[PDB]
Design a binder for this molecule. Structure first.
Ligand SMILES: [Cl-]
Ligand SMILES: [Cl-]
Ligand SMILES: [Cl-]
Ligand SMILES: [Cl-]
Ligand SMILES: [K+]
Ligand SMILES: [Mg+2]
Ligand SMILES: [Mg+2]
Ligand SMILES: [Mg+2]
Ligand SMILES: [Mg+2]
Ligand SMILES: [Mg+2]
Ligand SMILES: [Mg+2]
Ligand SMILES: [Mg+2]
Ligand SMILES: [Mg+2]
Ligand SMILES: [Mg+2]
Ligand SMILES: [Mg+2]
Ligand SMILES: [Mg+2]
Ligand SMILES: [Mg+2]
Ligand SMILES: [Mg+2]
Ligand SMILES: [Mg+2]
Ligand SMILES: [Mg+2]
Ligand SMILES: [Mg+2]
Ligand SMILES: [Mg+2]
Ligand code: NA
Ligand code: NA
Ligand code: NA
Ligand code: NA
Ligand code: NA
Ligand code: NA
Ligand code: NA
Ligand code: NA
Ligand SMILES: [Sr+2]
Ligand SMILES: [Sr+2]
Ligand SMILES: [Sr+2]
Ligand SMILES: [Sr+2]
Ligand SMILES: [Sr+2]
Ligand SMILES: [Sr+2]
Ligand SMILES: [Sr+2]
Ligand SMILES: [Sr+2]
Ligand SMILES: [Sr+2]
Ligand SMILES: [Sr+2]
Ligand SMILES: [Sr+2]
Ligand SMILES: [Sr+2]
Ligand SMILES: [Sr+2]
Ligand SMILES: [Sr+2]
Ligand SMILES: [Sr+2]
Lengths: 194, 237, 56, 92
RNA sequence: GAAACAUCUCAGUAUCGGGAGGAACAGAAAACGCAACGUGAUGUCGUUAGUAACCGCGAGUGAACGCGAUACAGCCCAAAC
RNA sequence: ACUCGUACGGUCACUGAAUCCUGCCCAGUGCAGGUAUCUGAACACCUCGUACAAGAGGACGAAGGACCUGUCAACGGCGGG
RNA sequence: GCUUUACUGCAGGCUGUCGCUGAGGACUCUCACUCCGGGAGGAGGACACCGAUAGCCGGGCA
């Protein structure tokens, strides 16, 4: 039979329809008055959280982050630039808003490590994402056969080096064949052409 | 070129800033709940460095020493009342609804409870004209008919220090002293006397503007100089 | 007044001093920032890639 | 100059002389789906677009004859080398 | 550089911000597509090749599959119950 | 920032104490107001096209422009016969 | 370096359109959102702000 989780999932397929439309209209009013990074006890999308790796355990933290909507907040050139490099308005950043959210969260919690994240909607001026962070130093996690990999030294600051799922997708690493010639094993090894 | 003088202004540097640390008080109306039982005695009449007009020092019934925007004919010993049921006397503050038509008023609020925005300079006044349940039409010092909320407070009488503009400065030194008390860079060098690099009207073998002086509203800062969006120019016609 | 020799006489102000962090006479006693190591500006030591030739 | 609307001349299709009809080549409308149209969309970004930033040039004082010679029996057309003519009017 | 120059080129170079390790990153196919009755995670080396592809179709720019090597290693969740 | 400011304000320009004065010109350029009609992009909408799409056309039409008016202590002009 | 009715572009301003954005070719409302108010509450209101795109102006700048 269907899980209770499948209903949270099916509601989030259309966040502008049904009971969720009313819920988000109410929640966003409280969210707009909240901070940049707000730690929350329980995830808004349980299915997605659990699907991404969350467990109702010690050392597993969730936090909602709001990042501004739109393109790059670019300053115009103060020196000589050829016509091609004179733009301000149409320039967009190479990192997506989800990745900016994950980084801001990881900085608010220096000891924790980013596991994953997901979208929880937007209004006209900003976007909200909930980031699942993990405590690599808590024994409740060092003994977890499903999460203890994040405790390794090489997993330190994993988000800033693009090792998150959102990191790997934004780096163009999804495709294993055609189209990923300049992306795998890294953008840097391929001369920054990805 | 180089940024024009009006552009250096917005950066808010020392040269363009007002000497706020030498200023006395932010002349706002008192916060009363409802009851009118707030009145006070005028203790002193001081000079306000920010507006070059006098300001009255009032001590209220509850023990609050605040500087208020002084109208004409207000002295030491005089009692001033602030509230809804206040007396229609010069120097009293009450909402526009309670003030009768045809009475000169000053320190008028824009949105009820802001503390006064309009008619604050030396000798000027706002004229209260029409009454309604919804709107109070006030004629501001510029001659404009401002439709306001009747719950907007205002002080009865014309502002003190009238006729200041009547006497000439005579000499540059007097202007210097007035300007040292304001948020203004003075003296003024004409753009026509500058280099092309410094102003749109700069350059030339003789002094005259480049293009015509009447500039469009859509003009960017650095080009918006001369006669900004002029409907007309000159005296005749 | 000339910008050269006669303007050098007014120079009796102390700005750059011995730094607590690096030991260089670059701690600006008015800015409270070291021009050499960045003490007072950053926790990280001031270093730049242009302090050496590009391929070195 | 004056040009006869219908006249006897060679047909490279029929391989014999037939009565041809002369018509001025009417410009066929563009689809906007050729490679050059797709390149105009792709190679245009911030600043100058190179070749796509150029505007159409001038005109020669006199253009050549742009004509179609349509066969009377087989109904197929052929193109010929044009000649400089300030005006080209047809007879009948 | 294009014997000017704007796209292009120099170059994702210089330089700047953030961060890990002793190495990093990548990685067990929603792959490939010598189309196959075929291959079988990933880096890297040789080659494929200055080939395909791009380009005021100018100057210039420029892969990959495959192959020969190196080394080889596959696994864990979410959900169902 | 102006601004502990509010039109007797303060911003932007021109001229340059006082005294006597400051003519004519709105065609061009600028600014501003208006505008039946004309022109005027994209989205959505309608027709054609495509089992879809590219694409072609139509309808509607903002500011702007055409057009009209105001304005020279606005740029300036004040001749030849 | 500087100028402009040089070429090409880039900011900026104006304007339409989409998102935020809701209820009953012009209109009413209040629930988002904005502002005023210490507060109660008041003004405004699906507009404005902001994100995106389109047309016009655009030596202010390259
Ligand atoms: Cl992290
Ligand atoms: Cl003054
Ligand atoms: Cl012809
Ligand atoms: Cl194969
Ligand atoms: K260049
Ligand atoms: Mg590598
Ligand atoms: Mg005040
Ligand atoms: Mg004056
Ligand atoms: Mg000063
Ligand atoms: Mg002057
Ligand atoms: Mg000079
Ligand atoms: Mg000179
Ligand atoms: Mg200039
Ligand atoms: Mg002169
Ligand atoms: Mg002059
Ligand atoms: Mg060259
Ligand atoms: Mg050439
Ligand atoms: Mg290249
Ligand atoms: Mg391939
Ligand atoms: Mg002079
Ligand atoms: Mg506020
Ligand atoms: Mg220039
Ligand atoms: Na962290
Ligand atoms: Na790319
Ligand atoms: Na492309
Ligand atoms: Na050359
Ligand atoms: Na040159
Ligand atoms: Na090119
Ligand atoms: Na004129
Ligand atoms: Na020079
Ligand atoms: Sr760290
Ligand atoms: Sr206040
Ligand atoms: Sr105030
Ligand atoms: Sr000049
Ligand atoms: Sr006149
Ligand atoms: Sr001197
Ligand atoms: Sr000194
Ligand atoms: Sr500092
Ligand atoms: Sr450094
Ligand atoms: Sr493109
Ligand atoms: Sr372009
Ligand atoms: Sr010609
Ligand atoms: Sr293998
Ligand atoms: Sr005079
Ligand atoms: Sr005119």
């Amino acid at each position: 039979a269907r899980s209770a989780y499948s209903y949270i999932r099916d509601a989030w397929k259309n966040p502008g329809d049904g009971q969720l439309a009313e819920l988000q209209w109410q929640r966003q009013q409280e969210w707009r008055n909240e901070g940049a990074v707000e730690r929350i006890e329980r995830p808004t999308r349980l299915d997605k959280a659990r699907s991404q790796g969350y467990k109702a355990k010690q050392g597993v933290i969730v936090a909602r982050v709001s990042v501004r909507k739109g393109s790059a907040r670019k300053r115009r050139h103060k020196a000589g630039r050829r016509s091609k490099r004179q733009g301000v308005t149409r320039i967009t950043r190479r990192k997506d808003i989800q990745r900016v959210a994950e980084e801001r969260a990881s900085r608010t919690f220096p000891n924790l490590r980013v596991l994953n994240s997901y979208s929880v909607g937007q209004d006209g001026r900003q976007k909200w994402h909930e980031v699942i962070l993990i405590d690599p130093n808590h024994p409740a996690i060092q003994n977890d056969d499903d999460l203890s990999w994040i405790c390794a030294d090489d997993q330190a600051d994993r988000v800033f080096r693009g090792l998150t799922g959102a990191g790997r997708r934004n780096r163009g690493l999804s495709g294993k064949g055609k189209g990923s010639e300049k992306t795998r094993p890294s953008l840097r090894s391929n001369g920054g052409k990805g | 070129g180089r940024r024009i003088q009006g552009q250096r202004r917005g950066r808010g540097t020392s040269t363009f800033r007002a000497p706020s640390h030498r200023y006395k008080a932010d002349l706002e109306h008192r916060k009363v709940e409802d009851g009118d039982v707030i009145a006070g005695t005028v203790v002193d009449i001081e000079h306000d460095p920010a507006r070059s007009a006098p300001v009255a020092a009032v001590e209220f019934e509850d023990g609050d020493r605040r500087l208020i925007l002084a109208p004409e004919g207000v002295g030491v010993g005089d009692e001033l009342q602030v509230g809804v049921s206040a007396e229609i006397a010069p120097g009293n503050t009450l909402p526009l609804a309670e003030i009768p038509e045809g009475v000169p008023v000053c320190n008028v609020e824009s949105s009820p409870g802001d503390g006064g925005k309009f008619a604050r300079a030396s000798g000027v006044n706002a004229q209260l004209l029409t009454h309604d349940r919804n709107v109070a039409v006030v004629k501001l010092p510029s001659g404009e008919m401002k439709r306001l909320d009747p719950q907007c407070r205002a002080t009865i009488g014309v502002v003190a220090g009238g006729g200041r503009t009547d006497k000439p400065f005579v000499k540059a030194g007097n202007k210097h002293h007035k300007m040292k008390a304001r948020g203004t860079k003075w003296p003024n060098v004409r753009g026509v006397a500058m280099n092309a690099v410094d102003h749109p009207f700069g350059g030339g073998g003789r002094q005259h503007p480049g293009k015509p002086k009447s500039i469009s509203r859509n003009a960017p800062p650095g080009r918006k100089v001369g006669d900004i969006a002029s409907k007309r120019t000159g005296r005749g016609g | 007044t000339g910008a050269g020799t006669p303007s050098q006489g007014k120079k009796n102000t102390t700005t750059h001093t011995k730094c607590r962090r690096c030991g260089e006479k670059s701690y600006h006693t008015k800015k409270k920032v070291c021009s050499s190591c960045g003490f007072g500006k950053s926790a990280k030591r001031r270093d730049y890639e242009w302090q050496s030739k590009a391929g070195e | 100059m004056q040009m006869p609307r219908r006249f006897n001349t060679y047909c490279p299709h029929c391989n014999e002389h037939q009565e041809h009809e002369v018509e001025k080549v009417r410009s066929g409308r563009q689809t906007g789906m050729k490679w050059i149209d797709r390149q105009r969309e792709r190679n245009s970004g911030i600043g100058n677009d190179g070749k796509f930033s150029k505007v159409p040039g001038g005109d020669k004082p006199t253009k050549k004859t742009d004509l179609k010679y349509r066969c009377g029996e087989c109904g197929k057309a052929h193109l010929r080398e044009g000649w400089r003519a300030g005006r080209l009017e047809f007879q009948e």
